[PDB]
């Protein structure tokens, strides 16, 4: 089999469509997602044209091996898509309506800067390499681009699924290449983070600040050290569910900042005790009393600054 | 091969059945389950009809490639089902009886709101896409829908396996699709959760409350902080075995609530000591004595409220 | 290809054999094991009869596709067995000697009640479905059922590998089914559990009991809390290597019981201190002195009871 | 099919090119990386030459099975590359231009000596085996060696992708083998390590040094022990993300060194207390005062020395 | 195809060779290793003989399907080897030179008794089942047994790769079987274990012994308990990287022994305090002073005994 011959010198327009059946396994560390979807391809092949009056048939069904099919690939896939041809239907003018169901593990980078309050744009790049006889160009049939109402991505809200209608046509290894961008806009469900990580982490930080109402060095050491160990456990638990970004993330920034509050609490607790021993409790008293107001105020302002910078 | 032609204009009814052989690997985080089962398909194909007298046989066996077979798919599968055709048989009137054995990893969302005392309804959606020549509608042959008596799903009780007999017929990309809902009702075996998580977690909370019978700030700090660290360990262990839900779960609610009891214990422990230092032990005495009754009472009532809201 | 014809009305007897080459990956949580073995099959197909005078050769060798082969399956497998035909030998009478090497991940439930001192019976169910022309029945050729002397299952002792010679012949979806039970009896190597989990866990419990020789509330609090945290770590480590059973396991029971000893130690430690403060150390003394004998004695008796109930 | 015959006695030059489409999954422990790329091969086959005038075509497209294709393999792959032929084109002089898209898991050893500030050189070894009829030699077509601008390797900066143009021609199993080295130079994004591991770990070490401003043995013990436990947690977290090297790594060296600072702090804390009890606080005072300067100074020098040795 | 006929009654000698290309993924818990290697097979097939002066060609290249190839398998593999035939060459006299490249996951048991200072012997068992027409026997062509100079197994030193030249010929299921033992001698790189596990673990044990220079029960309790918790963390981290052996390992023995030192320290710390309270500090003094010498001495001697027993 060979590709359809051009009437003049025009390139072959292959009309595409992706209808998402299932969305699953969004790996944050791997920056991957698994997809089960329909892929619809359409092009005109004059060699397949027929008379609908004489044949008595409106549509002719073919096997993939029987007719010429354009080699459509995905750019950002781990391995080649697991595909099963659903249908091939030819119209009297020779317009082929190909349909296949596929599953793929797609690599799409993620922006963790606003985590866990971040939104993403997942991509699926459709590509066709032009042949020596004639150039192939991709198009979007919006009537055949969509998603199942039941499509659910665990811990994520699916906003939109659209395609950038204008293909990215470019030279690659002395042959033409037509690329299409299928974009899946999603937003993270941040709810669980609040009672599981954020609030527990804040409560333990506030427990550390009860040392501003104590003169017992021994007890203070125990408070700050313990609550600090709990914070380390949270910092680790958090960093396990995220990849190593070459930038600061919102959660990361907050967590880091909290480490400084623990350091300064240790210093306060230390200074207070040194002074108490040095028979200067009145001076120690002023520092402890100031800390009671300073620590919450500076914590609140630092957070307002941080939130402003990130959002 | 082409589909059977209609006698009038009626759609082709494909009679389905699923007989569960093995149920395994119910992943809570992934919201998946693996299944090994028999799939049976039956439809009338007149072109295959024969006379028993002339042929000398009451049944005719064919190879899948030899005859027309409807393209039946599962909606909620990760990848295409690993299937092996068991038998194909034609009755004299042309009633095809197809059977295959398959294995699939099925995606079915789970409702963790009542965890670990929750019950689920797993789904298997059977689907058929109609062809340009004729419309295909799915049916359930209840005589061919069942499950092996030995079918066991680890940590779960299997209640029922039934099919919603009326198919969900809908338009998708200008072609009729017929969907069938195979429902597997299961209920979690909550037993292990009691001696492994619930009771240990309650015991450590009750240990924290022994600080209401102590005036030793240093000992109290040690109690509350330690028991709190143990609670964090339990909260982490729990959240590892569950996905991030955009809603509160029963276990989650309880765990969260317990964090507040730890906070108020710290406050009590702090206030008591401040007052002792302030040379006001009689006032601290009243607070500590009240706490001895208040903490259990408020804990019990809070739990009754919570259980009421969730169940 | 069609099945062989009966001389009278008798069913086709397919002789079976399983020779275990490798046993590995016994997943306790999954209740699975991987197996590499030889599957032998032998039946008479007179249609393949030959004269070795004419044909030249005494025994003929066929390709699986060339001749009729019974559709033999495994009931309790995750996916279809990875099989590679070793040999197909036909003797002049038409007796087929089919040999194949396979690998499979078998699901066989496990009884954790006596863990880590439990023994299991792993199963491999061979099954054949009877066709329209004639019924197929399975048989065991004991001369072809065995295992390699080198077969080792890590952390387990392999006792026996036998087959229940009488097949379970039953009706299923209006057709006959012949099932065979290949049983692999194994017993857990409990050795490692003693120096790794049991003894460490006992020592830490005994450390808590040194609080019965101390009057220092602050030191006692530290003992019981610490050792309790160590016990939680052990309880977690243990429950990670085990599935969630709807029943109590021996290790589980012991671990749970130990939690009660920690609770009562906390109570003792609390009561002793309260009394000390209440200026009643002589009464506190009696309780502490009693506890020194009571805790070991009650621990020993409770363990005798528990071991009696479980074994 | 047989290989092209030599015009004289010259070997067959197969021109190679690798164009990286996707780079992903760099496993540090496994010392592997997954790759999705184009493999472009080109050789001259005179048997396939044609005249453009009589043929009416400037180029001829073939199926892989139709013509002779050199058996090109990768040396350092886990399993054989998942490959799909894109396009085979023959020019009038018989210059075959082959293109295939592949995915492979490549094993390339990593040098962790300067971790997490290390740079690597990933390798892809292309190999061809010479046949009895003629010797086959590999060449690099630099015009066909490249990478996509979007190629991103998570937690790594991609520097270059080049090929060592001169092949390593050597004997293996009595046949000549031509090897080519495709090198991918990368450098680790060390950013995340600073706020996640390095700084937290330094802060906790500095917290232990507050014991040089305390005379409270009990408080000091609590400081050094706690901070030490936090350091152990960090050391474990670090060694989980790295393989077991038979050499010291930079992070490893630092971590190890810090353990010695903790040991000497314990000794100081111990000696100070012993002396305090021995009614020699003036001598203990000198040691504690010296330690305040000695510990940071000796720490800074130790780090300068270490950084010098490693960079 | 049928096997080569015997000239007399002699068995068919198949000359084997394994040339290791890549060694990777040595799983200690699984007792597996992955291998990428060349498999060479050589046997005389007189039916394939040809004249050299008449035919012109000295060597004839055949496709695997075209000629008879012996069914060579690996005994100790998880699944069947992923193999790709590289070359088949027939000599004038009919000697066949077959070569294939394979990848396999091999199960070879490991002896952890001297861990992490242990050496292993990995095995690859080549096997051939004899046919009804003639017996097949395996041989080793040492000229074709080897390994790549670049072959690296992470955390291991590769000593030798040899084959036991005399095959293990035995009866199995009424047919002859010829087995060959390919042995890969390796030794563990124990370096990393010293700064990561051994030294940290020793240091924390020595920290516990500072309680012999303290009379502060409260401080002593904190020392012994803390350091004990750190030891538990190390014991767990160690047992995670090792399988459950029915025997004692060197590391296991040491770790276990250390638990007894912690127990006796607790007893010492307890007895010392009891005596202090009992107004007998002079007697407590003798015990504490003795412990200062006893604990290191007994620790050193116990280790000498242990090392002697294990090595
Ligand atoms: C300790 C620090 C507490 C963190 C506070 C949340 C950060 C925030 O305010 O996050 C904001 C995000 C919404 O963000 P958005 O619309 O996606 O951003 C794009 C917005 N622009 C384009 C205007 C920049 O979530 C929320 O609705 C906040 C609810 C969570 C409160 C949890 C409190 C405990
Ligand atoms: C402190 C927290 C203790 C948790 C208590 C269990 C919550 C509960 O009462 O759970 C109730 C569930 C039963 O639920 P059901 O049949 O699914 O509900 C459907 C009912 N409707 C439709 C009316 C809403 O479990 C049980 O059988 C109770 C046994 C658990 C005891 C645990 C002891 C500790
Ligand atoms: C804390 C409690 C310590 C647990 C003690 C072991 C439990 C037990 O006594 O285990 C018993 C099992 C034997 O089991 P069996 O052959 O399956 O019994 C079948 C017997 N019937 C049919 C009569 C019921 O192990 C042993 O040989 C004992 C070695 C374990 C020593 C651990 C010391 C600590
Ligand atoms: C406490 C220990 C602090 C560790 C300090 C970083 C080590 C270093 O100096 O790292 C150096 C590497 C870059 O090195 P390069 O280009 O690979 O080396 C080639 C070097 N020659 C040519 C000299 C051999 O990182 C950096 O850019 C340093 C920024 C990180 C600072 C974090 C401090 C907290
Ligand atoms: C406290 C525990 C300290 C552990 C000491 C190492 C054990 C040992 O002494 O190990 C011995 C092995 C050498 O083994 P080999 O020659 O392979 O054995 C075969 C020996 N035969 C044939 C004689 C039986 O390792 C070493 O080279 C020791 C270097 C590590 C020192 C780390 C100190 C901390
Ligand atoms: Cl693709
Ligand atoms: Cl499907
Ligand atoms: Cl099977
Ligand atoms: Cl390859
Ligand atoms: Cl094999
Ligand atoms: Na085609
Ligand atoms: Na068909
Ligand atoms: Na067959
Ligand atoms: Na070819
Ligand atoms: Na062959
Ligand atoms: Na303490
Ligand atoms: Xe997408
Ligand atoms: Xe978070
Ligand atoms: Xe805490
Ligand atoms: Xe956050
Ligand atoms: Xe502190
Ligand atoms: Xe602050
Ligand atoms: Xe189901
Ligand atoms: Xe739970
Ligand atoms: Xe605790
Ligand atoms: Xe719960
Ligand atoms: Xe507290
Ligand atoms: Xe409360
Ligand atoms: Xe078995
Ligand atoms: Xe156990
Ligand atoms: Xe402990
Ligand atoms: Xe046990
Ligand atoms: Xe306690
Ligand atoms: Xe007790
Ligand atoms: Xe590469
Ligand atoms: Xe690091
Ligand atoms: Xe800490
Ligand atoms: Xe570092
Ligand atoms: Xe210390
Ligand atoms: Xe120092
Ligand atoms: Xe090997
Ligand atoms: Xe420690
Ligand atoms: Xe070790
Ligand atoms: Xe060791
Ligand atoms: Xe102790
Ligand atoms: Xe000792």
Author numbering:
A (entry chain E), B (entry chain A), C (entry chain B), D (entry chain D), E (entry chain C): 5 to 315
From the paper:
To improve the understanding of molecular interactions between xenon and transmembrane receptor targets, we investigated xenon binding with the Gloebacter violaceus ligand-gated ion channel (GLIC), a member of the pLGIC family, using X-ray crystallography under pressurized gas. Previously, the sensitivity of GLIC to gaseous anesthetics has been studied using 2-electrode voltage clamping techniques and this revealed that GLIC currents are inhibited by clinical concentrations of xenon. GLIC, whose X-ray structures has been solved in open, locally-closed (LC)–inactive- and resting-state conformations, is extensively used to identify binding sites of general anesthetics, channel blockers, alcohols, and other allosteric modulators in pLGICs. Here, we show by X-ray diffraction that xenon has multiple and specific binding sites in GLIC either in the open and LC (inactive) conformations, and that these binding sites differ between the two conformations.
Xenon-bound GLIC open and LC structures were obtained from crystals pressurized with 2 MPa (20 bar) of xenon and analysed by X-ray crystallography at 3.1 and 3.4 Å resolution respectively. In GLIC open form, xenon is found at three close but different locations in an intra-subunit cavity located in the upper half of the TMD. This cavity is lined by residues from a single subunit with contributions from helices M1 (Y197, I201, I202 and M205), M2 (V242), M3 (Y254, T255, I258 and I259), M4, the apex of the β6- β7 loop (Y119, P120, F121) and the M2-3 loop (N245). The cavity is accessible from the lipid bilayer, it penetrates the interior of the subunit along a direction that points towards the ECD-TMD interface. The first two locations of xenon are observed at the pocket entrance and were modelled as alternative poses of the same xenon atom with 0.5 occupancy each. The third xenon atom with 0.9 occupancy is deeply buried within the cavity in a highly hydrophobic environment. The xenon atoms are all engaged in van der Waals interactions with the hydrophobic side chains of surrounding residues and the alkyl chains of the lipid molecule. In GLIC open form, the intra-subunit binding site can be considered as a common anesthetic binding site, since it can bind not only xenon, but other anesthetics like propofol, desflurane or bromoform. In GLIC open form, xenon binds between M1 and M2 helices from one subunit and M2 helix from the adjacent subunit in the inner part of the TMD while in GLIC LC form, xenon binds between M1 helix from one subunit and M2 and M3 helices from the adjacent subunit in the outer part of the TMD. The second one, named minor interfacial site, is present only in the GLIC open form and is located in a small hydrophobic cavity in the middle of the TMD.
